[PDB]
mmCIF file of C-alpha atoms and ligand atoms in Angstrom:
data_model
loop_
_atom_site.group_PDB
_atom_site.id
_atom_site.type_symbol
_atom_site.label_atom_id
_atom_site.label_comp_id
_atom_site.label_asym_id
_atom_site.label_seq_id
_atom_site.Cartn_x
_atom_site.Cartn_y
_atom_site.Cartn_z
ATOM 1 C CA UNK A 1 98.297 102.151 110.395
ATOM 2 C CA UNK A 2 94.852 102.794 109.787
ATOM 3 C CA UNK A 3 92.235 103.180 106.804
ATOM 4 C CA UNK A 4 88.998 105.145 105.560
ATOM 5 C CA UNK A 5 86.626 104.418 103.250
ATOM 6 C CA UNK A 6 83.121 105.488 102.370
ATOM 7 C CA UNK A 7 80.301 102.923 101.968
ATOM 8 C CA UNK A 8 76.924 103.824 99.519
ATOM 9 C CA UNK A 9 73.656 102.164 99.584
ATOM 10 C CA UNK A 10 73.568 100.146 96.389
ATOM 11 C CA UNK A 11 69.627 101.526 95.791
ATOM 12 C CA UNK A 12 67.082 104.110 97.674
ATOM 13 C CA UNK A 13 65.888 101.388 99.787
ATOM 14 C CA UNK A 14 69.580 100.682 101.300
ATOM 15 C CA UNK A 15 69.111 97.247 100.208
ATOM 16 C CA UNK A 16 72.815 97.265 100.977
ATOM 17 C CA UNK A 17 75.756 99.380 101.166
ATOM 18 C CA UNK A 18 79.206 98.930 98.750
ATOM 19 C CA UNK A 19 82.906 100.372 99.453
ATOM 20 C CA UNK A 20 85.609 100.840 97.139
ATOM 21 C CA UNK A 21 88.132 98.151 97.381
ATOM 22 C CA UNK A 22 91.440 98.642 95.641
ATOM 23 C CA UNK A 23 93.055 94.974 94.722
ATOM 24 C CA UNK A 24 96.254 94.242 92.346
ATOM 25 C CA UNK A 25 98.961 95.704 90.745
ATOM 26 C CA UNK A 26 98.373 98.342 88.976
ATOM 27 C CA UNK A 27 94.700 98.311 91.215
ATOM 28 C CA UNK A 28 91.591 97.362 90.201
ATOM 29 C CA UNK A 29 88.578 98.480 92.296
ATOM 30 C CA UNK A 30 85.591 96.877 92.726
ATOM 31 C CA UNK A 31 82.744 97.829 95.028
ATOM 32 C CA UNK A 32 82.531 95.173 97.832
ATOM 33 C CA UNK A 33 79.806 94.157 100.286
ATOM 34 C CA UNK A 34 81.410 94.668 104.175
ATOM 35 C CA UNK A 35 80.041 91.364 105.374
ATOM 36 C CA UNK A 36 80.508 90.731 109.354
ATOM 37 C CA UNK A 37 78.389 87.950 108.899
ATOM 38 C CA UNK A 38 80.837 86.161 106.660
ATOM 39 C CA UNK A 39 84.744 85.274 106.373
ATOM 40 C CA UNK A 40 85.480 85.192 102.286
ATOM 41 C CA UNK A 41 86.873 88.287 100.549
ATOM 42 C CA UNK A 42 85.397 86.788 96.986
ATOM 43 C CA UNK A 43 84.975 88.826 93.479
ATOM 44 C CA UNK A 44 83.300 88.488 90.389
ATOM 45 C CA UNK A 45 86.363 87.861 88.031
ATOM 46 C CA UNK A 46 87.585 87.099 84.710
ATOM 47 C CA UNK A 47 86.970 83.521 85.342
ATOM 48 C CA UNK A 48 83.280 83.904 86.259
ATOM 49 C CA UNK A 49 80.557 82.171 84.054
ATOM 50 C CA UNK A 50 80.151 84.641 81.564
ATOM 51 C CA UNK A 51 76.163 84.012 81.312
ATOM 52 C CA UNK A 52 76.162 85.188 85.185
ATOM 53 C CA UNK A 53 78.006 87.988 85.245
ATOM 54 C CA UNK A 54 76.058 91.457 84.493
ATOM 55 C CA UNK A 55 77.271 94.234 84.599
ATOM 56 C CA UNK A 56 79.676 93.981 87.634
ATOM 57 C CA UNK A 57 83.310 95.099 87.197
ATOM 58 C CA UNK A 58 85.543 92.026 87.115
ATOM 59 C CA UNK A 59 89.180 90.993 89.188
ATOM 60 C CA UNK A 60 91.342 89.949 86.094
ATOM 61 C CA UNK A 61 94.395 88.459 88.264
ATOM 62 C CA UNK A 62 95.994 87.807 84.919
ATOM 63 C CA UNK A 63 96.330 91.677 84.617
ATOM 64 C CA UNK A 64 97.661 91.931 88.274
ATOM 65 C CA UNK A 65 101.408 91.256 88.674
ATOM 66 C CA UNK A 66 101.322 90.542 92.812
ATOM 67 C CA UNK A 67 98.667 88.164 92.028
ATOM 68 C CA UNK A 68 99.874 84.615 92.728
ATOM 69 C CA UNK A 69 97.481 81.769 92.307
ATOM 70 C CA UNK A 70 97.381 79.615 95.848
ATOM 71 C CA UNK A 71 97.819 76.363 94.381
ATOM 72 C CA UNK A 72 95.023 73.761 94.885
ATOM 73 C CA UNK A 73 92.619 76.087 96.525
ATOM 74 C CA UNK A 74 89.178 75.988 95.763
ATOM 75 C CA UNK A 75 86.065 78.009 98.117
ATOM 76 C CA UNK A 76 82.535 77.200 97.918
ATOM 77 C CA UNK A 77 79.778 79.136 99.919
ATOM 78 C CA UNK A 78 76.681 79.517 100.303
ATOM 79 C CA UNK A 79 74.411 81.976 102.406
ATOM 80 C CA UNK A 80 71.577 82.234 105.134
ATOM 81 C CA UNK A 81 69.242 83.922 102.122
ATOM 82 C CA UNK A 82 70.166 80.937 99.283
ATOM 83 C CA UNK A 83 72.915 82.521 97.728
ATOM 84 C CA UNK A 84 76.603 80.968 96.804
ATOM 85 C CA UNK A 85 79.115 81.324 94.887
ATOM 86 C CA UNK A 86 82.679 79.433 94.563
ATOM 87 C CA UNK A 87 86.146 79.087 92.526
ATOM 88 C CA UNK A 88 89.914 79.234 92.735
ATOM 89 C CA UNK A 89 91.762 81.385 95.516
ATOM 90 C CA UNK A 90 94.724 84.436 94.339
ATOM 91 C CA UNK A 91 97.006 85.970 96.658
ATOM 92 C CA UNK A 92 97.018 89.958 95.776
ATOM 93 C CA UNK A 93 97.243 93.360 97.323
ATOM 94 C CA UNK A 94 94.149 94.287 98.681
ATOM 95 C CA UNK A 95 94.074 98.004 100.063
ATOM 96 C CA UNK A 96 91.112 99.785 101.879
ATOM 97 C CA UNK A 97 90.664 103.543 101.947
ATOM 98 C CA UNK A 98 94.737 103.508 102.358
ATOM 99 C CA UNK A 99 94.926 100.551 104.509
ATOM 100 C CA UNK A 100 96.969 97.976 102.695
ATOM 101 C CA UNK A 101 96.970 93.907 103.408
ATOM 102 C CA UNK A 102 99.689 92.103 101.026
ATOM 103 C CA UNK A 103 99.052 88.371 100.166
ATOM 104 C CA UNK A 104 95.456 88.722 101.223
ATOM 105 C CA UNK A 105 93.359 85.171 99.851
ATOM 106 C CA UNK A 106 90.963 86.937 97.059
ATOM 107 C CA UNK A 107 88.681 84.515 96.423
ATOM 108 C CA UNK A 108 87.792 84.722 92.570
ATOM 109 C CA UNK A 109 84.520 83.077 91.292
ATOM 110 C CA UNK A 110 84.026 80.604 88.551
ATOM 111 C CA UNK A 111 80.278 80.617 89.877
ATOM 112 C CA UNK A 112 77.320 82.796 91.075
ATOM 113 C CA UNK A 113 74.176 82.197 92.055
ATOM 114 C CA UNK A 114 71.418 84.288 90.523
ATOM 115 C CA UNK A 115 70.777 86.654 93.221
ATOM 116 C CA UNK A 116 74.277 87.689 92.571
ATOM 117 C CA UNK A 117 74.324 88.117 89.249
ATOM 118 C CA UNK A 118 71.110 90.253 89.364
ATOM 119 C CA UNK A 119 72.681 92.674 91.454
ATOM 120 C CA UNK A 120 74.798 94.456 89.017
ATOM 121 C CA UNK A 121 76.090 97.224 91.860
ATOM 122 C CA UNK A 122 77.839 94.408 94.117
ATOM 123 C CA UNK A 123 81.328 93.169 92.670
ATOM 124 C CA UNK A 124 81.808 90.626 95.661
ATOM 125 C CA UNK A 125 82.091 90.349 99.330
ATOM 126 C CA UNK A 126 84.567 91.304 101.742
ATOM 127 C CA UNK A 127 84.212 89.223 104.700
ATOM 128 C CA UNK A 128 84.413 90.749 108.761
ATOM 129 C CA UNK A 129 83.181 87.697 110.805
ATOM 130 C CA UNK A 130 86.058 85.652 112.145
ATOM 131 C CA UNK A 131 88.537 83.332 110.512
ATOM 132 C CA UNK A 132 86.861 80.447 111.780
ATOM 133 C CA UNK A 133 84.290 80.327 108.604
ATOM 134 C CA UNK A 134 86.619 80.984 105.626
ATOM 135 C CA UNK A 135 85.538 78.253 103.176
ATOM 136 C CA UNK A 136 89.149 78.472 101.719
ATOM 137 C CA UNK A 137 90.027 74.667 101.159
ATOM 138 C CA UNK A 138 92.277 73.041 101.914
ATOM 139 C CA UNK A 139 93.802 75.487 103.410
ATOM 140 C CA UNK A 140 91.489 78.423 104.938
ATOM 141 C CA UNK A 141 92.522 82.100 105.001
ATOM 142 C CA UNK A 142 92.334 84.657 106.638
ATOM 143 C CA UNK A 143 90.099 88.100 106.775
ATOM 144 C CA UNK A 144 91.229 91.490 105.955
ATOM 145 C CA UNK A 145 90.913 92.151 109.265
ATOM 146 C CA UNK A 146 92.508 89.506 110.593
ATOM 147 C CA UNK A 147 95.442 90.349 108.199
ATOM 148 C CA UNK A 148 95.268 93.882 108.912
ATOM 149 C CA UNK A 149 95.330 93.526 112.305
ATOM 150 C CA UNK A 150 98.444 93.669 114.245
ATOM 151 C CA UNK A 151 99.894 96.490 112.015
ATOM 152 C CA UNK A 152 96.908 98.735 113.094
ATOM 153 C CA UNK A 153 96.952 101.204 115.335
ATOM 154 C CA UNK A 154 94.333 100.151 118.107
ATOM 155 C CA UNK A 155 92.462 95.739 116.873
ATOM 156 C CA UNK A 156 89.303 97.599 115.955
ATOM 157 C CA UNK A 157 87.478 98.408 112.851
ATOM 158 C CA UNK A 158 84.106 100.275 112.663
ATOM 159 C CA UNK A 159 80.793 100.517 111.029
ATOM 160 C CA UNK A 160 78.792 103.630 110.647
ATOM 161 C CA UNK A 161 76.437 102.920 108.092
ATOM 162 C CA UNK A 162 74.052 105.938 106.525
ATOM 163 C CA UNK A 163 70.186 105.593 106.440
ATOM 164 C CA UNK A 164 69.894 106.643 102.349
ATOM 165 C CA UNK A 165 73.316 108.294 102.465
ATOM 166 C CA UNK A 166 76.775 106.753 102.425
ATOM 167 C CA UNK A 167 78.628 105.943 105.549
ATOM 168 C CA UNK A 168 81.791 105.328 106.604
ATOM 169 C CA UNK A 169 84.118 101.933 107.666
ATOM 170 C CA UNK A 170 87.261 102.694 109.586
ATOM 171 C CA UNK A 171 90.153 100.424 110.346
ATOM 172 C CA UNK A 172 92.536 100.888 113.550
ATOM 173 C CA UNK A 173 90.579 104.148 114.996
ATOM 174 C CA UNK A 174 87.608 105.298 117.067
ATOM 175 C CA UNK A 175 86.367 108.786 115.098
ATOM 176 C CA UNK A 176 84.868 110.121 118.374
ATOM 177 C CA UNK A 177 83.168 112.795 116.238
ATOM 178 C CA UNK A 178 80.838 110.214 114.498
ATOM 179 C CA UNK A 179 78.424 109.260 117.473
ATOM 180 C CA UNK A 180 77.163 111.312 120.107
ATOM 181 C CA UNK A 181 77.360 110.135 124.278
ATOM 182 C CA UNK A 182 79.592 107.067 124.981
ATOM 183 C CA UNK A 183 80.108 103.595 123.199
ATOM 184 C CA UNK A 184 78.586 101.113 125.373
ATOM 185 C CA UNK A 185 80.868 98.090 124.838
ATOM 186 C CA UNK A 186 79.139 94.271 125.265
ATOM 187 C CA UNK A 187 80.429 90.678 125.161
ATOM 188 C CA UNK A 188 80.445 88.344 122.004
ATOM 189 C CA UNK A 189 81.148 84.838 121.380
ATOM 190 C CA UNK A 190 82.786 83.525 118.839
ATOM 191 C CA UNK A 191 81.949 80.359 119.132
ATOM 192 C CA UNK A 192 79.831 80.340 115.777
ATOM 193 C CA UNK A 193 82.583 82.621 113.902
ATOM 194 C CA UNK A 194 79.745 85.660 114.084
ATOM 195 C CA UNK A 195 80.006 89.023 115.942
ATOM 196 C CA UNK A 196 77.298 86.976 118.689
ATOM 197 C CA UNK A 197 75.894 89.236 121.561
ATOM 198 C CA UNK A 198 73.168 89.183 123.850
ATOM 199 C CA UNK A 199 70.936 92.598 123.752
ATOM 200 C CA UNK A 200 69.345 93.323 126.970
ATOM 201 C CA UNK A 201 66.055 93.604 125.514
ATOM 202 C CA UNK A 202 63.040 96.029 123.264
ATOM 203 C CA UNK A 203 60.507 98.913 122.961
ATOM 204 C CA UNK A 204 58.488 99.905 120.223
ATOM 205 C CA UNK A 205 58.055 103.574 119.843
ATOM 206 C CA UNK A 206 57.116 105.305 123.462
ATOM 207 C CA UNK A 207 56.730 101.925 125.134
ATOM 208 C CA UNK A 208 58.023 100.455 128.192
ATOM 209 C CA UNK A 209 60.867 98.911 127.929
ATOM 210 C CA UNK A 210 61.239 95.501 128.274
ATOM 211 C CA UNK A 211 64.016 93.584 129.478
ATOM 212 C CA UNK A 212 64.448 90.375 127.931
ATOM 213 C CA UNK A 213 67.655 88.338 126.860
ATOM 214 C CA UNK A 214 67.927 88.467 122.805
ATOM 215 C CA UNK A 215 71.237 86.573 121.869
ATOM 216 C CA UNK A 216 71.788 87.630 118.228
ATOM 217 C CA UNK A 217 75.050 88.608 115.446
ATOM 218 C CA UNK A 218 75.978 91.915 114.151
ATOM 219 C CA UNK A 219 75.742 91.497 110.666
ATOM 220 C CA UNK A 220 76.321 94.027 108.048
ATOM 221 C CA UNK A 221 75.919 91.892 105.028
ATOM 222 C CA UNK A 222 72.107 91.387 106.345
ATOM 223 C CA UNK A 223 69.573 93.845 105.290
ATOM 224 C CA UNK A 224 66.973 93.706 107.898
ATOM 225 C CA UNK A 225 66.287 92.905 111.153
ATOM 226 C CA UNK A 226 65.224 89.450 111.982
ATOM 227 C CA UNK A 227 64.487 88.865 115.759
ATOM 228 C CA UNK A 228 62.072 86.510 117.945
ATOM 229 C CA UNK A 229 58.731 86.390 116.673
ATOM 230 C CA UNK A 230 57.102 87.471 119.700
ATOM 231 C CA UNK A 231 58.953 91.061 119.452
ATOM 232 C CA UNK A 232 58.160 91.172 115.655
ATOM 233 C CA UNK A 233 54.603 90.321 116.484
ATOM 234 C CA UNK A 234 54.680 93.210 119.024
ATOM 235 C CA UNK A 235 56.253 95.471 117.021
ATOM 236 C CA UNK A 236 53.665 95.054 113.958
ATOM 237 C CA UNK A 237 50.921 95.468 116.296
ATOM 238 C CA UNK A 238 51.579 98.981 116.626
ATOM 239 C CA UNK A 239 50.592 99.552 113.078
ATOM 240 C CA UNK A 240 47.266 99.879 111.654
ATOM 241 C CA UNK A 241 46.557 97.357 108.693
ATOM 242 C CA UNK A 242 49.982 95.395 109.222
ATOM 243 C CA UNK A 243 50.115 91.740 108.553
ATOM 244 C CA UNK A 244 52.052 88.452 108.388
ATOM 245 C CA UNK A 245 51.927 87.497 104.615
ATOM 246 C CA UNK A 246 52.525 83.702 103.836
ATOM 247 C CA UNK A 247 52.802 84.760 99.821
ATOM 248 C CA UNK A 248 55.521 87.520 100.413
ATOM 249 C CA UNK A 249 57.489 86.242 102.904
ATOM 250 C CA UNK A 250 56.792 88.263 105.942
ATOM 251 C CA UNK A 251 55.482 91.189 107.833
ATOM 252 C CA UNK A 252 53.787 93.783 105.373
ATOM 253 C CA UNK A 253 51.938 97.564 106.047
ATOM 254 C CA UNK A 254 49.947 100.044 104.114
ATOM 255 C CA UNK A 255 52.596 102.284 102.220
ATOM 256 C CA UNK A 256 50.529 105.260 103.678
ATOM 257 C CA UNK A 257 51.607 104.384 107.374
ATOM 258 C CA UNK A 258 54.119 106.614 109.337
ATOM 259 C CA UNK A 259 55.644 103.665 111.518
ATOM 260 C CA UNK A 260 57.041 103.762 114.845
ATOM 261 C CA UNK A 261 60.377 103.387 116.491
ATOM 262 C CA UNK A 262 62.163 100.438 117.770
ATOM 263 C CA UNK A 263 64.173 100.749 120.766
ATOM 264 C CA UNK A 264 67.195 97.594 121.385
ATOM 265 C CA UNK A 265 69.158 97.627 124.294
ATOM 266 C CA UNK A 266 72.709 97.145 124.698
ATOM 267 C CA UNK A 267 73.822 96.728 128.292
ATOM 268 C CA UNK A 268 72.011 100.126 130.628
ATOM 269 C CA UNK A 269 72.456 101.835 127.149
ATOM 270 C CA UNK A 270 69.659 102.518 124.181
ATOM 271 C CA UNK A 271 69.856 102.596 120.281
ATOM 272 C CA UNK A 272 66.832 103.734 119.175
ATOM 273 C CA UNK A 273 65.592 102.653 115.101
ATOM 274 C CA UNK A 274 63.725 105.794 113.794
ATOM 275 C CA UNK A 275 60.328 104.440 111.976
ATOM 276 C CA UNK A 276 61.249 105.555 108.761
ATOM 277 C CA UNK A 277 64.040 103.327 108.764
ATOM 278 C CA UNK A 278 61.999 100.192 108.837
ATOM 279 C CA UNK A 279 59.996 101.311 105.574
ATOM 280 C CA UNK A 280 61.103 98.776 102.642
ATOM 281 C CA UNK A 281 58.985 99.920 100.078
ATOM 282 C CA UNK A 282 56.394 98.362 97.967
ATOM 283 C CA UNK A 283 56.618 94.716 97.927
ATOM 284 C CA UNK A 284 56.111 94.915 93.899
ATOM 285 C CA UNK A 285 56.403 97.790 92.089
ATOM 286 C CA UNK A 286 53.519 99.921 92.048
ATOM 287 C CA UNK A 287 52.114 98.181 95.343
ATOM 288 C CA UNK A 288 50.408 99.985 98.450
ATOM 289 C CA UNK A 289 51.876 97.279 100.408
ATOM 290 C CA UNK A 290 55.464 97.831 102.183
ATOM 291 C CA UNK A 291 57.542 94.993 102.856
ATOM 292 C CA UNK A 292 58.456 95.707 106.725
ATOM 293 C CA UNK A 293 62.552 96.052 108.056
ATOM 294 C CA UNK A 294 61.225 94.089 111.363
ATOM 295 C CA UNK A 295 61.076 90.342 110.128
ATOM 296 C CA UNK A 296 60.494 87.341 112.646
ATOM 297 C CA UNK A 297 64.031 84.969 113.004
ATOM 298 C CA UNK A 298 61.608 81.746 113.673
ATOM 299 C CA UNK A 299 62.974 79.961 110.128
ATOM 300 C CA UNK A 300 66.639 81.184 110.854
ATOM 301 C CA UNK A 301 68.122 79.600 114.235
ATOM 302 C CA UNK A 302 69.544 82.831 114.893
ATOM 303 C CA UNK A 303 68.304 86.481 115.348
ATOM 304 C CA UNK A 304 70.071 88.865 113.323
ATOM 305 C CA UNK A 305 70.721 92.847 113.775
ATOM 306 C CA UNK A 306 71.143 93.019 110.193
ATOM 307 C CA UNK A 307 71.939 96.685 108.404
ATOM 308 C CA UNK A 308 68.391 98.254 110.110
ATOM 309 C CA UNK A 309 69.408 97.838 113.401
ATOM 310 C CA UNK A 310 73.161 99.049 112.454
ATOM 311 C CA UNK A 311 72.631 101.902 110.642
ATOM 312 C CA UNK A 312 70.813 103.318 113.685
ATOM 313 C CA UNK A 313 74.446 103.326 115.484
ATOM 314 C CA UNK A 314 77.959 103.422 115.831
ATOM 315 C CA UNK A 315 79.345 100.087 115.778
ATOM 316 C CA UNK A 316 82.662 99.426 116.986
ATOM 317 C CA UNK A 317 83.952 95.679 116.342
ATOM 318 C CA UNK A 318 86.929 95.151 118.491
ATOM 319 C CA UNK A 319 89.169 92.388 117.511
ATOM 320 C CA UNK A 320 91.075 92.761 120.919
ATOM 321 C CA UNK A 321 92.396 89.279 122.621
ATOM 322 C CA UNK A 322 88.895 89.297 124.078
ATOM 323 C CA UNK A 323 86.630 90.413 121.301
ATOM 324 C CA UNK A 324 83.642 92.671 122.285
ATOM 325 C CA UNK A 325 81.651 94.708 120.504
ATOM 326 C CA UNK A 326 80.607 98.735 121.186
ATOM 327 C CA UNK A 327 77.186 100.459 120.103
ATOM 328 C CA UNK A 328 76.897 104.282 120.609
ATOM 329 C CA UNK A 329 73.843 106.629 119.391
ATOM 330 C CA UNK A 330 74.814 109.327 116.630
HETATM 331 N N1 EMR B 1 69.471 89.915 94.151
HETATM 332 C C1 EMR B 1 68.626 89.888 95.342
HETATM 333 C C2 EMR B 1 69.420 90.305 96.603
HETATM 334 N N2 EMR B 1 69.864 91.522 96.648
HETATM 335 C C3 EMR B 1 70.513 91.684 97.872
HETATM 336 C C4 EMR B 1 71.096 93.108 98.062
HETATM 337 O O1 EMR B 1 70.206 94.107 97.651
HETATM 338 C C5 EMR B 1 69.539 93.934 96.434
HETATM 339 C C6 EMR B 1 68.916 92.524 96.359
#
């Protein structure tokens, strides 16, 4: 088998992208949040706080009649950015762009943190990092993915997120008319539970390249790009007026500035960032100061090729006995 589905920027800064996600009997479909960085498939729901829910659509598993409530599980999570959210645990139907999974764990919250109840265009997360982190107790569960898995037609799904346009996330194939040259495959461990690979190194715009080691996870539910602060500070340099900000949080630049490129390596192979693409917008509304899509991974522990770096390939996540992951221009 195999499945299609288009994923949308929630906003014009492609703060982050949402696909369909059909779940229940008859479905109901919510927009989800394609997380590789994460292992919970998790909706708002009937159950949710009503005071923090806001204008997502809700999972009502009372309404569902494949929905069977996993008896004494409970998840609780909570996020590299401050966010969490937890409840009780369903069994359901859970299909993706005609991929189906039955008796998938859909996590349904009795709790959100603010951040997710202010964005009123993300109905939950759907979780692509391996098994290893589900927070399903006391027995964890597995991903969609992982679920889906065997019954596909080659252990793979892929991400081909837009840069202000939707995208597309296939299951079980390799569309080899949505990148141009070849996918240039690379190890990961999963010894965290993340997509974890080692980059071969940077440039920033017509700069030499330079090879240096940058271990780091492809992560979709991440906006930005968060790497060592001695490539951010290199990057940043190249623009006129840019600036670490204590009060906002990170790198900023003049709104007016045209910024350059940022080259990552992946094995002998090249992805190249347009500038454009690492242009966040004011940092308040009205501002001439842009937040930047380069931010330093020094308060992290980990560097992250977030959505920024992503949406500037291909990305093939193989889920093969060995799992490796594939990067290709487009
Ligand atoms: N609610 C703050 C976090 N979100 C994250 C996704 O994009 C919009 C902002």
């Amino acid at each position: 088998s195999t499945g299609s589905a288009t994923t949308t920027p929630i906003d014009s800064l492609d703060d982050a992208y949402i696909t369909p996600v059909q779940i229940g009997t008859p479905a109901q479909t919510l927009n989800l949040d394609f997380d590789t960085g994460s292992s919970d498939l998790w909706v708002f729901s009937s159950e949710t706080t009503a005071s923090e829910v806001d204008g997502q659509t809700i999972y009502t598993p009372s309404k569902s009649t494949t929905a069977k409530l996993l008896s004494g599980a409970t998840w609780s999570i909570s996020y590299g950015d401050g966010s969490s959210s937890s409840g009780d645990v369903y069994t359901d139907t859970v299909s993706v762009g005609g991929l189906t999974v039955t008796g998938q764990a859909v996590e349904s919250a009795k709790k959100v943190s603010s951040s997710f109840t202010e964005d009123s265009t993300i109905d939950g997360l759907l979780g692509l990092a391996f098994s290893t982190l589900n927070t399903v107790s006391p027995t964890q569960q597995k991903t969609f993915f992982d679920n889906a898995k065997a019954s596909l037609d080659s252990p793979v799904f892929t991400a081909d997120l837009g840069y202000h346009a939707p995208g597309t996330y296939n299951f079980g194939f390799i569309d080899t008319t949505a990148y141009t040259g070849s996918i240039t495959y690379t190890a990961v461990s999963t010894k965290q539970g993340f997509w974890e690979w080692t980059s071969t190194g940077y440039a920033v715009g017509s700069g030499t390249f330079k090879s240096t080691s940058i271990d780091g996870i492809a992560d979709t539910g991440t906006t930005l790009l968060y790497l060592p602060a001695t490539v951010v500070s290199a990057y940043w340099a190249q623009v006129s007026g840019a600036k670490s900000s204590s009060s906002v949080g990170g790198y900023v630049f003049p709104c007016s500035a045209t910024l350059p490129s940022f080259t990552f390596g992946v094995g002998s192979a090249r992805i190249v960032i347009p500038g454009d693409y690492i242009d966040f917008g004011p940092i308040s509304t009205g501002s001439s100061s842009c937040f930047g899509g380069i931010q330093s991974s020094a308060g992290i522990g980990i560097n992250i090729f977030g959505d920024v770096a992503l949406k500037a390939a291909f990305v093939v996540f193989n889920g093969a006995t060995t799992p490796t992951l594939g990067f290709a221009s487009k």
